[PDB]
Amino acid sequence: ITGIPTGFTELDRMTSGFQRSDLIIVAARPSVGKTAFALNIAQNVATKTNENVAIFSLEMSAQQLVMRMLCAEGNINAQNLRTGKLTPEDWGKLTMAMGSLSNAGIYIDDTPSIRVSDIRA
Amino acid sequence: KCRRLKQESGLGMIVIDYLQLIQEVSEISRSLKALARELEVPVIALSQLRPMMSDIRESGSIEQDADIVAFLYEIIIAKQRNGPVGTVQLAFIKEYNKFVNL
Amino acid sequence: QDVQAFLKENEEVIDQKMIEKSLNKLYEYIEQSKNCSGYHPKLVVNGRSIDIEYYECKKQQSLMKSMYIQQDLLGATFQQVDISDPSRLAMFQHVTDFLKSYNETGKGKGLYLYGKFGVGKTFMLAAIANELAEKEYSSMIVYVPEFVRELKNSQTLEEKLNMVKTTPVLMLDDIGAESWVRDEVIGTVLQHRMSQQLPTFFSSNFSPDELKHHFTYSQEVKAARLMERILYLAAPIRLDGENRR
DSSP states (O other), rough: SSOOOOTTTSSSOOOOOOOOOOOOOOOOOOTOOOHHGGGGGGGGGIIISSSOOOOOSSSSSSSTTTGGGTTTTGGOOSSOOOOOOOOTTTTTSSSTTTTSSSSSOOOOOSSSOOOHHHOOO | OOOHHHHHTTOSSSSSOOSOOOOTTTTTTGGGGGSTTOOOOOOOOOOOOOOSSSSSSSSSSSSTSOOOOOOOOEEEBBBBBSSSSSEEEEEEEEOOOOEEEE | HHHHHHHSSSSSTHHHHHHHHHHHHHHHHSSSSSSOOOEEEEEEEETTEEEEEEEEEOOSSSOEEEEOSSSOOOOOSSSSSSOOOOTTTSSSSSTTTTTOOOOOOOOOOOOEEOOOTTTTSHHHHHHHHHTTTSSSSSSEEEEOOOOOOOOSSSOOTTTSSTTSSSEEEEEEEEEOOOOSOOOTTTTTHHHHSSSSSSOOOEEOOOOOOTSSSSSSOOOOOOOOOSSSSTTSSSOOOOOOOHHHH
């Protein structure tokens, strides 16, 4: 801790940043859950640890990125929450999962194979 | 074989097979956009890209030239303009080539 | 009304939220024809979702079935059978005492009919076949040797492992008859219902210390994944009484 955090306890371990002057890289293989991991270096640094972050997602859009962290700190990814409505034990598992999805740095960019241009400005 | 078959036999549903070959691609996606005011009656299609949303947004134009955008990997139709956002849980027979009501 | 029946049937397995998740199913279940003019709809719990399977169509036979045996010699019942010795002194005590404790989902423990031929393995389940009969539940008398001969060798396949698992009363015959390959038929049946729970049924010729000289080797610690689900659903019981062959 100096410092700006990472999210995970054993990843804020040897770093403590994740600081305002370094490029950070983490990647997986075909079917290991890649952004599934990126969410949680940003989820904290949006909903809880209050800093504004613009997810300029090259892969996923903005009408798809919603679920993977409605499912994270919410545990509603088997109901299934790929569709439909809720139960007498799930009606409000989202009152603070889609209730905790804008009180955060969440202004997603959705577009495909963009050049560096329409990102920086 | 569409406008002369419109005023001859019937035509209420145009039915096609898959997209990425029927002859880049962001060109002809709009070609099926200018008909919706000309012959007036629902059009259908098939395409190729897990089960996300902006994948056929890469294989043409699609998400802006074809309203409802369905997917396959439970049809994760997370963007649609005819019905509300849902996902149609469908199983298969596996031999008799039949789709089933779950 | 159908939902009520199914709910209490599988209460031990079903959760309140499961009901609301499978609402569409249970509502469609009750809304459709409960009877028939060749099958009838019945609710079954499959994992976290409740499905609707069709079973083939006083009242004592129609509400009773059997899988892979003949219905000639199954004309058996409780009470009236000429009781012999400690072979049947304590056999009609746990099939009549519990004709209302086969609880839908409220642990109604089972039996395991082993021992020797012509006396007891399958007719004590033919006994329930004409006793648990008047009240309107089905009770399918599944036979083992006759199953895995079309299922040791390969029409459809992944179909009859579910209406063997979506009805309130069952009866299995001969465990251990004829890692391994007898995999997706009988082995899974034991693991499932620690999170669902009803009255379980298996039976054989081999006791809990003899069921395992025939279910085939692996050379291991890779076969006792289904055998602490018998030791906690009955008692080490056999049958040595009277020949009826």
